[PDB]
Design a protein around this ligand. Structure first.
Ligand SMILES: Nc1ncnc2c1ncn2[C@@H]1O[C@H](COP(=O)(O)OP(=O)(O)O)[C@@H](O)[C@H]1O
Ligand SMILES: Nc1ncnc2c1ncn2[C@@H]1O[C@H](COP(=O)(O)OP(=O)(O)O)[C@@H](O)[C@H]1O
Ligand SMILES: CC(=O)N[C@H]1[C@@H](O)[C@H](O)[C@@H](COP(=O)(O)O)O[C@@H]1O
Ligand SMILES: CC(=O)N[C@H]1[C@@H](O)[C@H](O)[C@@H](COP(=O)(O)O)O[C@@H]1O
Ligand SMILES: [Ca+2]
Ligand SMILES: [Ca+2]
Ligand SMILES: [Ca+2]
Ligand SMILES: [Ca+2]
Ligand SMILES: [Mg+2]
Ligand SMILES: [Mg+2]
Ligand SMILES: [Zn+2]
Ligand SMILES: [Zn+2]
Lengths: 308, 308
């Protein structure tokens, strides 16, 4: 009965494991915090995979393999996480294929989470049938994935599409990658979470009709007329938009898909920045918000569904 | 006798026409200022091509076709300049193939000048045999060209590799494209020409051992201990370097080739900026100065030499 993939997504905050059908339905999803150390992370990945596999049988899903989405630079051919920013600590030169395949007796695929988001958009989303498109995924950090001639660009050292580390300032705010001025350092969930705490420190966030502060408190305060939070979100969205201009002037994709919970909040500013600053010849670019609920996780599943 | 191409290069300052051998030797080169209006430009292109063709016979070169390098966005399949920044005025929706082929009775190729630079580096330079590399060409403006899987990326609307309009500031100096903060607006010949005039206005450029001010006067003054010109060149080189980081984090090429007269002056700062700010996984990138005398012109010739 139902042909399915096991999908794993390891982000800067959450570790999720899901049973996903051929058709891109999430049958069941398990969620935990991503642990901070390697030993706990690998054990929890395995514990959650074994449990999902046992539930898949009770749900009458036939698991065909495991696909893993992860932050960090990844060698997909060897199923190895090569290097991670400190958003995921202790996550360097890690062979994920061997332990998962030995424990579960399944084939294992691995890729960067932004590259998985791209794979999801190509198979189940608005990238379907397109020769070239780019996706930018806002979560804790900002991920990217690039499709060119229908296929991912991985780069000569698996570092293509690290689009959160597009730099749009000569100075600008520090990034967790160790640089500064990265679009991630302006616009990611953790960057807005930081700015929200800053405001709230000076008691300058909460406004009439409001009450773990974070991004959505900043957005909710701007909608309700807070001038300094609007400004912060404008700077953030402008930075993201300039990151998008660089992509347009680099790859010139026909479509840019923004996903993650911040996507809806940024789209209108990104389109304004393109209009105001990009070359005329890229003005026909389509910029949309993703119609998928969890691109990374669906993308991890798509590696299994397409290549098994 | 000698198999050759006619090559034309139209930049922001100069219009050059050359007879180039199979082997990438420039047999003879004619140089004029690029005119400012369409009528004069097209007439001078034709006048210089007819003359070069007549000299080729006297030099015993057999011309196989004409390749044209030009600033602006170009549809190579149709031989049409689509849109140009004001660096070349009156240079929109221009069919170059028809008039050149009717007048010279030769096949005509056309591409952006940065894309031609890439073609030159792939055939005659340090891009030979490489799956992926990028070139950035500094002249009046900054051009780019991207090779991926051995071939140019032109983009879904012929605007790929407009790398001079990578943006590395939320504000920054105005660019001739109409934006601001573009690497071209910091680091191109015309941007340094502007800063040199600024210094010299405040009588603050010339130092002991010096005497149409321009980029090389700024570089020559910094070598000789002028602190404000050093600073200007540092900001310029940092901007270019951040443009390079964006490319690395986007395409992750194995090689970046800097060309044009400013290349030697920028290389050491670009490598410093990469070292200080790019992800670890792109630190093995090779960054070199081009060994070719005129990549754009040689690239225009390479379209003829390779495809005739
Ligand atoms: N209601 C919400 N839903 C999803 N993400 C949120 C929400 N509120 C804040 N966020 C931001 O997005 C992150 C959680 O989204 P997720 O895709 O799980 O992130 P990751 O890929 O970083 O694990 C949090 O770190 C937070 O910064
Ligand atoms: N000695 C030099 N040789 C080449 N280029 C120079 C020199 N001095 C300044 N330049 C800069 O480069 C431009 C000329 O180089 P070229 O490749 O002919 O430019 P373009 O492609 O803009 O015509 C000038 O606009 C100037 O800003
Ligand atoms: C561990 C690491 O190096 N992460 C970087 C990317 O590789 C990742 O794609 C992105 C999105 O992560 P998210 O926001 O947590 O989904 O974060 C960081 O920029
Ligand atoms: C006319 C026009 O739109 N030019 C733009 C590019 O297309 C061109 O590649 C570049 C290099 O020109 P150069 O410096 O004069 O060689 O200049 C501008 O950025
Ligand atoms: Ca830490
Ligand atoms: Ca990526
Ligand atoms: Ca003008
Ligand atoms: Ca170009
Ligand atoms: Mg995630
Ligand atoms: Mg030129
Ligand atoms: Zn960064
Ligand atoms: Zn510009």
């Amino acid at each position: 009965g139902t042909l399915s993939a096991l999908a794993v997504d390891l982000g800067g905050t959450n570790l999720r494991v899901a049973i996903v059908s051929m058709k891109g339905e999430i049958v069941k999803k398990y969620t935990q915090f991503n642990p901070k150390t390697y030993e706990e992370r690998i054990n929890l990945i395995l514990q959650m995979c074994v449990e999902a596999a046992a539930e898949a049988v009770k749900l009458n899903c036939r698991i065909l393999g495991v696909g893993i989405s992860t932050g960090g630079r990844v060698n997909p051919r060897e199923g190895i996480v090569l290097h991670s920013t400190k958003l995921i600590q202790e996550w360097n030169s890690v062979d994920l294929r061997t332990p998962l395949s030995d424990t579960l007796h399944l084939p294992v695929w691995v890729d960067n989470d932004g590259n998985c988001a791209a794979l999801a958009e190509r198979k189940f989303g608005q990238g379907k049938g397109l020769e070239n498109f780019v996706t930018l995924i806002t979560g804790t950090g900002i991920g990217g994935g690039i499709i060119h001639q229908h296929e991912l660009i991985h780069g000569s050292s698996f570092c293509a599409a690290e689009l959160g580390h597009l730099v749009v300032s000569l100075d600008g705010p520090d990034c967790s990658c160790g640089s500064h001025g990265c679009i991630e350092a302006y616009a990611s969930g953790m960057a807005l979470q930081r700015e929200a705490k800053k405001l709230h420190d000076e008691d300058l966030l909460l406004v009439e009709g409001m009450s773990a502060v974070g991004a959505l408190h900043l957005i909710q305060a701007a909608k309700l007329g807070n001038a300094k939070a609007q400004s912060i979100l404008r700077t953030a969205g402008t930075a993201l938009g300039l990151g998008v201009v660089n992509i347009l002037h680099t790859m010139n994709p026909s479509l840019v898909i923004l996903s993650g919970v911040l996507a809806s909040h940024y789209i209108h500013i990104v389109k304004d920045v393109i209009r105001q600053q990009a070359l005329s010849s890229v003005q026909d670019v389509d910029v949309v918000v993703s119609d998928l609920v969890d691109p990374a996780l669906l993308g991890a599943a798509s590696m299994v569904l397409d290549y098994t």
